[PDB]
Amino acid sequence: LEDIIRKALMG
Amino acid sequence: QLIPPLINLLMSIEPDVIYAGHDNTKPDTSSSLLTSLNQLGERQLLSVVKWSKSLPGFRNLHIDDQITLIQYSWMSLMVFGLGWRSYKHVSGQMLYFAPDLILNEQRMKESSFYSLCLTMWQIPQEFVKLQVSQEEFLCMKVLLLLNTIPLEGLRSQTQFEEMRSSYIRELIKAIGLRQKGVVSSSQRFYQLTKLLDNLHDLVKQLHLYCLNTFIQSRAMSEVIAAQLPKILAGMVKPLLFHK
Numbered sequence: 277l278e279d280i281i282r283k284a285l286m287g
Numbered sequence: 288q289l290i291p292p293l294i295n296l297l298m299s300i301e302p303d304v305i306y307a308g309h310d311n312t313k314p315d316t317s318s319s320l321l322t323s324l325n326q327l328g329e330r331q332l333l334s335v336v337k338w339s340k341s342l343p344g345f346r347n348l349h350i351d352d353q354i355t356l357i358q359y360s361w362m363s364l365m366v367f368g369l370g371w372r373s374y375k376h377v378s379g380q381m382l383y384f385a386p387d388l389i390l391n392e393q394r395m396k397e398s399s400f401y402s403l404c405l406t407m408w409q410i411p412q413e414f415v416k417l418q419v420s421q422e423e424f425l426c427m428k429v430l431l432l433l434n435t436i437p438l439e440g441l442r443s444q445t446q447f448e449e450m451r452s453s454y455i456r457e458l459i460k461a462i463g464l465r466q467k468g469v470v471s472s473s474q475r476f477y478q479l480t481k482l483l484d485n486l487h488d489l490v491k492q493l494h495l496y497c498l499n500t501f502i503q504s505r506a507m508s509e510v511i512a513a514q515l516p517k518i519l520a521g522m523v524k525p526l527l528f529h530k
């Protein structure tokens with residue numbers, strides 16, 4: 277999920 | 288002049304109701320419940336990441352710490368919210384995942400993961416017993432996000448410790464709203480933090496169940512290598528309030 281919780285933070 | 292400003296901001300940044308998009312007009316099946324939990328699960332995660340972006344102090348932490356903290360605690364955050372909704376909407380008598388995904392005792396027993404339902408059911412029952420307030424809950428939930436860090440710590444370690452210290456002070460204000468006495472409010476603080484300390488154990492139970500559920504879906508060594516640090520002791524560092 278590290279990629280999901282990462283694209284979400286930077287939006 | 289009744290509720291503290293920060294506790295009120297937490298309530299206002301509280302994400303809206305999230306639906307699982309489950310169809311309750313069809314007989315349940317092991318897969319349709321698992322399919323719905325995963326759909327709802329992913330939505331709630333985007334919800335957590337977003338909620339965090341409005342949390343005083345969070346964005347000021349290094350981006351790598353924000354990711355780490357979300358990774359380390361999304362399971363506990365979600366199971367904590369589950370408990371809260373179960374506790375207030377149905378008196379902790381059933382698991383209130385979403386308005387369209389509620390599982391009572393019967394539906395639990397006949398859901399593919401009954402033993403996992405009892406484990407998660409523990410949190411709502413505690414809430415009932417302790418009669419947890421909304422102000423207390425909100426402060427407790429922030430602490431869950433700040434309850435686990437890497438063994439080596441965080442890049443913004445000092446900034447992080449100061450954020451956690453504030454929400455700890457905020458939890459005490461929340462307790463002070465009803466528990467006026469020095470000994471009483473002191474005793475409740477212990478009860479609420481002891482509870483949070485207990486989630487470290489329950490949480491790995493959930494990650495383990497998550498992994499096994501995955502193993503059974505397809506019937507691999509690399510997938511199990513990245514999950515063990517979430518179900519096993521000695522890889523991350525839990526911040527306990529009590530020795």
Ligand SMILES: COC[C@]1(OC)CC[C@H]2[C@@H]3CCC4=CC(=O)CCC4=C3[C@@H](c3ccc(/C=N/O)cc3)C[C@@]21C
Pocket residue numbers: 277280321324325326327328329330331332362365366368369384400403493494496497498500501
């Ligand atoms: C049958 O269970 C399968 C699980 O694991 C197979 C193991 C534990 C579940 C989570 C328990 C906490 C929770 C609270 C909610 O508010 C609804 C969803 C939820 C869970 C589910 C879940 C699915 C996906 C995600 C995130 N996706 O990006 C998060 C939570 C399913 C698991 C993890």
